[PDB]
Write a protein that binds this ligand. Structure first.
Ligand SMILES: NC(=[NH2+])NCCC[C@H](N)C(=O)O
Ligand SMILES: [Mg+2]
Ligand SMILES: [Mg+2]
Ligand SMILES: [Mg+2]
Ligand SMILES: [Mg+2]
Ligand SMILES: [Mg+2]
Ligand SMILES: [Mg+2]
Ligand SMILES: [Mg+2]
Ligand SMILES: [Mg+2]
Ligand SMILES: [Mg+2]
Ligand SMILES: [Mg+2]
Ligand SMILES: [Mg+2]
Ligand SMILES: [Mg+2]
Ligand SMILES: [Mg+2]
Ligand SMILES: [Mg+2]
Ligand SMILES: [Mg+2]
Ligand SMILES: [Mg+2]
Ligand SMILES: [Mg+2]
Ligand SMILES: [Mg+2]
Ligand SMILES: [Mg+2]
Ligand SMILES: [Mg+2]
Ligand SMILES: [Mg+2]
Ligand SMILES: [Mg+2]
Ligand SMILES: [Mg+2]
Ligand SMILES: [Mg+2]
Ligand SMILES: [Mg+2]
Ligand SMILES: [Mg+2]
Ligand SMILES: [Mg+2]
Ligand SMILES: [Mg+2]
Ligand SMILES: [Mg+2]
Ligand SMILES: [Mg+2]
Ligand SMILES: [Mg+2]
Ligand SMILES: [Mg+2]
Ligand SMILES: [Mg+2]
Ligand SMILES: [Mg+2]
Ligand SMILES: [Mg+2]
Ligand SMILES: [Mg+2]
Ligand SMILES: [Mg+2]
Ligand SMILES: [Mg+2]
Ligand SMILES: [Mg+2]
Ligand SMILES: [Mg+2]
Ligand SMILES: [Mg+2]
Ligand SMILES: [Mg+2]
Ligand SMILES: [Mg+2]
Ligand SMILES: [Mg+2]
Ligand SMILES: [Mg+2]
Ligand SMILES: [Mg+2]
Ligand SMILES: [Mg+2]
Ligand SMILES: [Mg+2]
Ligand SMILES: [Mg+2]
Ligand SMILES: [Mg+2]
Ligand SMILES: [Mg+2]
Ligand SMILES: [Mg+2]
Ligand SMILES: [Mg+2]
Ligand SMILES: [Mg+2]
Ligand SMILES: [Mg+2]
Ligand SMILES: [Mg+2]
Ligand SMILES: [Mg+2]
Ligand SMILES: [Mg+2]
Ligand SMILES: [Mg+2]
Ligand SMILES: [Mg+2]
Ligand SMILES: [Mg+2]
Ligand SMILES: [Mg+2]
Ligand SMILES: [Mg+2]
Ligand SMILES: [Mg+2]
Ligand SMILES: [Mg+2]
Ligand SMILES: [Mg+2]
Ligand SMILES: [Mg+2]
Ligand SMILES: [Mg+2]
Ligand SMILES: [Mg+2]
Ligand SMILES: [Mg+2]
Ligand SMILES: [Mg+2]
Ligand SMILES: [Mg+2]
Ligand SMILES: [Mg+2]
Ligand SMILES: [Mg+2]
Ligand SMILES: [Mg+2]
Ligand SMILES: [Mg+2]
Ligand SMILES: [Mg+2]
Ligand SMILES: [Mg+2]
Ligand SMILES: [Mg+2]
Ligand SMILES: [Mg+2]
Ligand SMILES: [Mg+2]
Ligand SMILES: [Mg+2]
Ligand SMILES: [Mg+2]
Ligand SMILES: [Mg+2]
Ligand SMILES: [Mg+2]
Ligand SMILES: [Mg+2]
Ligand SMILES: [Mg+2]
Ligand SMILES: [Mg+2]
Ligand SMILES: [Mg+2]
Ligand SMILES: [Mg+2]
Ligand SMILES: [Mg+2]
Ligand SMILES: [Mg+2]
Ligand SMILES: [Mg+2]
Ligand SMILES: [Mg+2]
Ligand SMILES: [Mg+2]
Ligand SMILES: [Mg+2]
Ligand SMILES: [Mg+2]
Ligand SMILES: [Mg+2]
Ligand SMILES: [Mg+2]
Ligand SMILES: [Mg+2]
Ligand SMILES: [Mg+2]
Ligand SMILES: [Mg+2]
Ligand SMILES: [Mg+2]
Ligand SMILES: [Mg+2]
Ligand SMILES: [Mg+2]
Ligand SMILES: [Mg+2]
Ligand SMILES: [Mg+2]
Ligand SMILES: [Mg+2]
Ligand SMILES: [Mg+2]
Ligand SMILES: [Mg+2]
Ligand SMILES: [Mg+2]
Ligand SMILES: [Mg+2]
Ligand SMILES: [Mg+2]
Ligand SMILES: [Mg+2]
Ligand SMILES: [Mg+2]
Ligand SMILES: [Mg+2]
Ligand SMILES: [Mg+2]
Ligand SMILES: [Mg+2]
Ligand SMILES: [Mg+2]
Ligand SMILES: [Mg+2]
Ligand SMILES: [Mg+2]
Ligand SMILES: [Mg+2]
Ligand SMILES: [Mg+2]
Ligand SMILES: [Mg+2]
Ligand SMILES: [Mg+2]
Ligand SMILES: [Mg+2]
Ligand SMILES: [Mg+2]
Ligand SMILES: [Mg+2]
Ligand SMILES: [Mg+2]
Ligand SMILES: [Mg+2]
Ligand SMILES: [Mg+2]
Ligand SMILES: [Mg+2]
Ligand SMILES: [Mg+2]
Ligand SMILES: [Mg+2]
Ligand SMILES: [Mg+2]
Ligand SMILES: [Mg+2]
Ligand SMILES: [Mg+2]
Ligand SMILES: [Mg+2]
Ligand SMILES: [Mg+2]
Ligand SMILES: [Mg+2]
Ligand SMILES: [Mg+2]
Ligand SMILES: [Mg+2]
Ligand SMILES: [Mg+2]
Ligand SMILES: [Mg+2]
Ligand SMILES: [Mg+2]
Ligand SMILES: [Mg+2]
Ligand SMILES: [Mg+2]
Ligand SMILES: [Mg+2]
Ligand SMILES: [Mg+2]
Ligand SMILES: [Mg+2]
Ligand SMILES: [Mg+2]
Ligand SMILES: [Mg+2]
Ligand SMILES: [Mg+2]
Ligand SMILES: [Mg+2]
Ligand SMILES: [Mg+2]
Ligand SMILES: [Mg+2]
Ligand SMILES: [Mg+2]
Ligand SMILES: [Mg+2]
Ligand SMILES: [Mg+2]
Ligand SMILES: [Mg+2]
Ligand SMILES: [Mg+2]
Ligand SMILES: [Mg+2]
Ligand SMILES: [Mg+2]
Ligand SMILES: [Mg+2]
Ligand SMILES: [Mg+2]
Ligand SMILES: [Mg+2]
Ligand SMILES: [Mg+2]
Ligand SMILES: [Mg+2]
Ligand SMILES: [Mg+2]
Ligand SMILES: [Mg+2]
Ligand SMILES: [Mg+2]
Ligand SMILES: [Mg+2]
Ligand SMILES: [Mg+2]
Ligand SMILES: [Mg+2]
Ligand SMILES: [Mg+2]
Ligand SMILES: [Mg+2]
Ligand SMILES: [Mg+2]
Ligand SMILES: [Mg+2]
Ligand SMILES: [Mg+2]
Ligand SMILES: [Mg+2]
Ligand SMILES: [Mg+2]
Ligand SMILES: [Mg+2]
Ligand SMILES: [Mg+2]
Ligand SMILES: [Mg+2]
Ligand SMILES: [Mg+2]
Ligand SMILES: [Zn+2]
Lengths: 101, 116, 112, 140, 154, 59
RNA sequence: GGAUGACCCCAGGCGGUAGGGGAGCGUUCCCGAUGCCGAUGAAGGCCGACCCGCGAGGGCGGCUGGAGGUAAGGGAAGUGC
RNA sequence: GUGGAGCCUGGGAGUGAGGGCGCGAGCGAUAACGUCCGCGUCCGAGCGCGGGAACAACCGAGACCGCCAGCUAAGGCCCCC
RNA sequence: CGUGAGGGAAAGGUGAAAAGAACCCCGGGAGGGGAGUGAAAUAGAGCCUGAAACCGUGGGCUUACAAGCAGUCACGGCCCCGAGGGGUUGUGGCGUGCCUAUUGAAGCAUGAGCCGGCGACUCACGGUCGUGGGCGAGCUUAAGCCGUUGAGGCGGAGGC
């Protein structure tokens, strides 16, 4: 069984036992959360229009982090314009527990 | 009191030269050419972070198109059908289904054909 | 067990000697001797001296067998240049660099 | 999740009969086959389309007065070295080159594109020497 | 560039040498040339207002008074010039050297005995000043110095 | 003429590529049949003075 | 909101040359310092894929080095190529 | 009409070589990538982004940062694409 | 250097102590290899530290059908350190150096071979406005004098 869930304005195919980084969520580490399901597949196939009324994926919050730093660098020629920015994207790491059909 | 340069410029130049590791010739060896290369590289990375989102959408769409044509419709009919059926699986996941779950993608083609 | 010798501040241009050193790198002592004897370059005299010095060091100081010796590594480094004036036409003076070489030879033993 | 990238695949050998088909509208389909964009796992940076065998290339068709008025051109690098060969003459002398040229211009430039072009095998007359590959006959 | 030792000669012609143009070698662009806007001998003093100084003096003593760190004394018992004597007096006075002390007395003999101690700063009353007060954790004056202090802040 | 001059400094890569033809070839040497010393062919042996199987030279 | 930048919530602004304003980093030196860190290793050098910081930077670790360095908070400039 | 609106006082400027395009005229030849004014615009300073094969000023659109998510603009949807 | 008046450099550091390497070995010598000294000898006198350009030896990855402001985004291969990361780059996408000057520059307009070090908005007095304090119909001293020896005070002439 696999599900396509939606969190952080993005969609991911998840199965039980998957670890996944998503956009940060207000959930204590160790809390468990329920993600909405767009489509079920594997054994049976259920198609959301757009979301499946019963379905949910249960995920355990493993913790929150900050991604590896990206250098945002800006430069315009002949105008003495330079900008240096450090960006670290917050994230939440999830452990997918079960797909509740 | 006097405040000579001392250690300050060497340290500043070494930060730049370390970022330029791997560049060709004086672009990784000379502080001046390294910094000019880094200027371009920073603008490129910013521009290509943006451009990467488009590149991957093109690839999804091309793959989605080919999976569609195995079932006798084209991409643009398939997308319209999903819109009318209310399905909102995105192109990243449609392209993954097209390759990894051909049965599921076929049922999606079914829904799209039926919606019009 | 390695043995080495260095001739430092030899008054010859590095690029010239390196040509000769490249001839013997990785060669048995005896084959390097025959090569150096019939190399028509000034550098051969100098590489031959450093080579023989390393061989003597191997036998007399480091308990290695002469029959077992090969040129394990060898390289020429550049030393301080002697700067000299070269007068040209119309009152110009150029600087000639009479370059200088540190010649290293390292011998090891070819077991069996 | 990262996008699927295929491990290397056995290519598909394919056979197309050129007789009666319009030169340009046949070429775009061959180009698509060579790029492998009919395949759901298409990847832009590896050679993974079909091998395309074409027979009866001398029987390709063309509209208007192109037989007389379409000119192929070659530059030798020498003064006056521009050669102009009309389509008629090319068909009379190296007919397989009409389709090859039409297809090559529709493939990407660069190392991968030149590689894809080698996977196209064009033959005048009804026969090809690739039985060992057992090409699958295609209707396009 | 005017005070350096070199001549005012133009080192080479303006034009047609192929080098950058130059005048004399004392110009600050040259190694060994003059300094642009270097320090010159300078008077850093200024007349702080008298009322600010006077009122400053009172506040520095008042701050010590409010912490309980101000102690007045009538006399220094057996302090006749020797460090060991001022030490013995300080012990009973509660000054064990765990806190720095500003000792303000006109008794020259008492200043001589205390002054070598690392934790003591010694002043005659006419020298009371807020830097020295704020420098030290404790303030000790005899009643005579306490009085010339009062005359000053009035 | 008008004094040609290099337009750009030659790169380390292009300098050393031009030198890809500069390595020496070892001397051609054969053993002397009389004394087994290595020496150039078609020359009188410098170690024993023999050539064509006979003494030609004090050495 | 709470009550005075404690931090949170909602909303909106945030392309930029000449140029105006604001907040910071670092360098030399002084007070702090008759202190404190230092041969169980100062400064400087060479690394690092680690930590903090938007950034200038600051830590920490290994190697080198072998005798100096200097905090919170302030002060002054021969202060950053 | 609450807007990086307006008005008053005062501190600090920079600018006083503009340029393309549209429209209205003069000059020119109902010439000029011409020239000189007016209204507007953009570039200047948005040589950042999409389209126009490429291309400051034509069309689209005002780039705080990140995303392997979605909708559109001009322009496109035979292949290169 | 200049006939001359005159111009006018560069160049500091072994170690606590010379204990400055007897003697042997290759070499004509230079230089080195051992021995030995030293806490340390890439502190060995061409000596503290010992950056960078620049030169070389060894190793990993890579390269002889390929179009390039040299990077960047992606994926894959190999090597390395142990659902991760570092090195390398085959292919695919995108992509007109920096500075200056200009209406406008990748520009075939200026400057720069590369590296390291030196290198340009200050100071005094007066002015004007803002600002942190002191005192307020008042505010403030100057030169000096006394004290101190990194102690402050006195001094009202005068100024606003
Ligand atoms: N009574 C004194 N002023 N004592 C000061 C202590 C020592 C001071 N440096 C001096 O020269 O006197
Ligand atoms: Mg969400
Ligand atoms: Mg799993
Ligand atoms: Mg993320
Ligand atoms: Mg940068
Ligand atoms: Mg530029
Ligand atoms: Mg540019
Ligand atoms: Mg600039
Ligand atoms: Mg400009
Ligand atoms: Mg710039
Ligand atoms: Mg100093
Ligand atoms: Mg400086
Ligand atoms: Mg310095
Ligand atoms: Mg420096
Ligand atoms: Mg710098
Ligand atoms: Mg450094
Ligand atoms: Mg720095
Ligand atoms: Mg590289
Ligand atoms: Mg190079
Ligand atoms: Mg190179
Ligand atoms: Mg280098
Ligand atoms: Mg971006
Ligand atoms: Mg972009
Ligand atoms: Mg987009
Ligand atoms: Mg169809
Ligand atoms: Mg739609
Ligand atoms: Mg949709
Ligand atoms: Mg020869
Ligand atoms: Mg021997
Ligand atoms: Mg001369
Ligand atoms: Mg001359
Ligand atoms: Mg002459
Ligand atoms: Mg020379
Ligand atoms: Mg087809
Ligand atoms: Mg693509
Ligand atoms: Mg036709
Ligand atoms: Mg033929
Ligand atoms: Mg083409
Ligand atoms: Mg192209
Ligand atoms: Mg002068
Ligand atoms: Mg003078
Ligand atoms: Mg003078
Ligand atoms: Mg003089
Ligand atoms: Mg003079
Ligand atoms: Mg003069
Ligand atoms: Mg004069
Ligand atoms: Mg003069
Ligand atoms: Mg001139
Ligand atoms: Mg000249
Ligand atoms: Mg020149
Ligand atoms: Mg010059
Ligand atoms: Mg010059
Ligand atoms: Mg001149
Ligand atoms: Mg001058
Ligand atoms: Mg002068
Ligand atoms: Mg002078
Ligand atoms: Mg000088
Ligand atoms: Mg000087
Ligand atoms: Mg001097
Ligand atoms: Mg001097
Ligand atoms: Mg100066
Ligand atoms: Mg000056
Ligand atoms: Mg000056
Ligand atoms: Mg003075
Ligand atoms: Mg001042
Ligand atoms: Mg004064
Ligand atoms: Mg008064
Ligand atoms: Mg004392
Ligand atoms: Mg003292
Ligand atoms: Mg004290
Ligand atoms: Mg004192
Ligand atoms: Mg001539
Ligand atoms: Mg001529
Ligand atoms: Mg010529
Ligand atoms: Mg001539
Ligand atoms: Mg010439
Ligand atoms: Mg030239
Ligand atoms: Mg090389
Ligand atoms: Mg070359
Ligand atoms: Mg003999
Ligand atoms: Mg907010
Ligand atoms: Mg801004
Ligand atoms: Mg402000
Ligand atoms: Mg600071
Ligand atoms: Mg700070
Ligand atoms: Mg600094
Ligand atoms: Mg000082
Ligand atoms: Mg002190
Ligand atoms: Mg100290
Ligand atoms: Mg200690
Ligand atoms: Mg010790
Ligand atoms: Mg250590
Ligand atoms: Mg320091
Ligand atoms: Mg220091
Ligand atoms: Mg650091
Ligand atoms: Mg250190
Ligand atoms: Mg050590
Ligand atoms: Mg000391
Ligand atoms: Mg300090
Ligand atoms: Mg501080
Ligand atoms: Mg202070
Ligand atoms: Mg000063
Ligand atoms: Mg300066
Ligand atoms: Mg505004
Ligand atoms: Mg305004
Ligand atoms: Mg100002
Ligand atoms: Mg003005
Ligand atoms: Mg102006
Ligand atoms: Mg004017
Ligand atoms: Mg004007
Ligand atoms: Mg003009
Ligand atoms: Mg005008
Ligand atoms: Mg205007
Ligand atoms: Mg134009
Ligand atoms: Mg117009
Ligand atoms: Mg119109
Ligand atoms: Mg008009
Ligand atoms: Mg008119
Ligand atoms: Mg006409
Ligand atoms: Mg015009
Ligand atoms: Mg016109
Ligand atoms: Mg006109
Ligand atoms: Mg206009
Ligand atoms: Mg301008
Ligand atoms: Mg625009
Ligand atoms: Mg604008
Ligand atoms: Mg620009
Ligand atoms: Mg562009
Ligand atoms: Mg455009
Ligand atoms: Mg375009
Ligand atoms: Mg285009
Ligand atoms: Mg534009
Ligand atoms: Mg904006
Ligand atoms: Mg759409
Ligand atoms: Mg449209
Ligand atoms: Mg088109
Ligand atoms: Mg297409
Ligand atoms: Mg003369
Ligand atoms: Mg003379
Ligand atoms: Mg003179
Ligand atoms: Mg000197
Ligand atoms: Mg000495
Ligand atoms: Mg010493
Ligand atoms: Mg010795
Ligand atoms: Mg001897
Ligand atoms: Mg001898
Ligand atoms: Mg001998
Ligand atoms: Mg000797
Ligand atoms: Mg030796
Ligand atoms: Mg020992
Ligand atoms: Mg020890
Ligand atoms: Mg060392
Ligand atoms: Mg040392
Ligand atoms: Mg020392
Ligand atoms: Mg040293
Ligand atoms: Mg050295
Ligand atoms: Mg190598
Ligand atoms: Mg080819
Ligand atoms: Mg190849
Ligand atoms: Mg690329
Ligand atoms: Mg891709
Ligand atoms: Mg990897
Ligand atoms: Mg990679
Ligand atoms: Mg370019
Ligand atoms: Mg351009
Ligand atoms: Mg720059
Ligand atoms: Mg310039
Ligand atoms: Mg100009
Ligand atoms: Mg101009
Ligand atoms: Mg112009
Ligand atoms: Mg160019
Ligand atoms: Mg050029
Ligand atoms: Mg010119
Ligand atoms: Mg240029
Ligand atoms: Mg000019
Ligand atoms: Mg030059
Ligand atoms: Mg260089
Ligand atoms: Mg520099
Ligand atoms: Mg100023
Ligand atoms: Mg000054
Ligand atoms: Mg001033
Ligand atoms: Mg002022
Ligand atoms: Mg004021
Ligand atoms: Mg007052
Ligand atoms: Mg008041
Ligand atoms: Mg007056
Ligand atoms: Zn012989």
């Amino acid at each position: 069984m696999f599900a396509i869930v939606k969190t952080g304005g993005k969609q991911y195919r998840v199965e039980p036992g998957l670890k996944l980084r998503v956009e940060k969520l207000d959930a204590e580490p160790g809390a468990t959360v329920e993600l909405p399901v767009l489509l079920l597949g594997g054994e049976k196939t259920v198609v959301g229009t757009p979301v499946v009324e019963g379905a949910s994926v249960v995920a355990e919050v493993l913790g929150h982090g900050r991604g590896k730093k990206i250098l945002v660098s800006k430069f315009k020629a002949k105008v003495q314009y330079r900008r240096k920015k450090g960006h670290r994207q917050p994230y939440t790491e999830l452990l997918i527990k079960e797909i509740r059909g | 009191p006097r405040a000579k340069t001392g250690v300050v410029r060497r340290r500043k130049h070494k930060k730049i030269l370390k970022l330029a590791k791997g560049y060709w010739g004086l672009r990784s060896k000379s502080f001046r050419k390294a910094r000019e290369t880094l200027f371009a590289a920073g603008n490129y990375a910013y521009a290509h972070r943006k451009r990467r989102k488009r590149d991957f959408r093109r690839l999804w769409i091309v793959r989605i198109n080919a999976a569609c044509r195995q079932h006798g419709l084209n991409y643009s009919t398939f997308i319209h059908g999903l819109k009318k059926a209310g399905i909102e699986v995105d192109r990243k996941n449609l392209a993954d289904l097209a390759v990894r779950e051909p049965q599921v993608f076929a049922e999606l083609v079914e829904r799209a054909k039926a919606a019009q | 067990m390695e043995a080495k010798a260095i001739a430092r501040y030899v008054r010859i241009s590095p690029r010239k000697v390196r040509l000769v050193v490249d001839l013997i790198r990785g060669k048995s002592l005896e084959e390097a001797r025959n090569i150096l004897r019939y190399t028509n370059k000034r550098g051969a005299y100098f590489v031959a001296k450093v080579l023989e010095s390393a061989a003597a060091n191997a036998v007399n100081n480091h308990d290695m067998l002469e029959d077992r010796l090969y040129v394990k590594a060898a390289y020429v480094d550049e030393g301080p240049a002697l700067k000299r004036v070269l007068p040209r036409a119309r009152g110009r003076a150029d600087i000639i660099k009479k370059r200088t070489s540190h010649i290293t030879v390292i011998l090891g033993e070819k077991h069996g | 999740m990262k996008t699927y990238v295929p491990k290397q695949v056995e290519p598909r050998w394919v056979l197309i009969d050129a007789e009666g088909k319009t030169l340009g509208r046949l070429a775009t389909k061959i180009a698509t086959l060579l790029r492998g964009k009919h395949r759901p796992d298409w990847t832009p940076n590896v050679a993974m389309g079909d091998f395309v065998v074409v027979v009866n290339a001398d029987k390709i068709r063309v509209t208007g007065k192109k037989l007389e008025q379409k000119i192929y051109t070659r530059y030798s690098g020498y003064p006056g070295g521009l050669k102009k060969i009309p389509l008629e003459k090319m068909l009379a002398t190296h007919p397989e080159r009409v389709l090859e040229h039409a297809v090559k211009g529709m493939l990407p430039k660069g190392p991968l594109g030149r590689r894809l072009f080698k996977r196209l095998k064009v033959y005048a007359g009804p026969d090809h020497p690739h039985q060992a590959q057992r090409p699958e006959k295609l209707e396009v | 560039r005017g005070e350096v030792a070199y001549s005012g000669r133009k080192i080479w012609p303006q034009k047609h040498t192929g080098r950058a143009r130059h005048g004399d070698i004392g110009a600050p662009i040259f190694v060994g040339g003059g300094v642009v806007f270097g320090p010159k001998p300078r008077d850093y003093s200024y007349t702080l207002p008298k009322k600010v100084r006077k009122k400053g003096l009172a506040m520095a003593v008042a701050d010590r008074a409010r912490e309980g760190k101000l102690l007045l004394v009538e006399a220094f018992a057996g302090v006749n010039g020797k460090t060991k004597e001022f030490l013995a007096w300080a012990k009973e006075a509660g000054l064990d050297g765990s806190e720095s002390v500003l000792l303000v007395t006109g008794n020259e003999l008492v200043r001589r005995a205390a002054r070598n101690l690392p934790w003591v700063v010694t002043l005659a009353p006419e020298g009371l000043n807020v830097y020295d007060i704020v420098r030290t954790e404790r303030l000790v004056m005899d009643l005579d110095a306490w009085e010339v202090f009062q005359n000053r802040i009035g | 003429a008008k004094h040609p001059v290099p337009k750009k400094k030659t790169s380390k890569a292009r300098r050393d590529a031009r030198r890809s033809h500069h390595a020496l070839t070892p001397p051609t040497l054969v053993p002397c049949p009389e004394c087994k010393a290595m020496k150039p062919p078609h020359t009188v042996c410098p170690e024993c003075g023999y050539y064509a199987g006979r003494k030609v030279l004090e050495v």
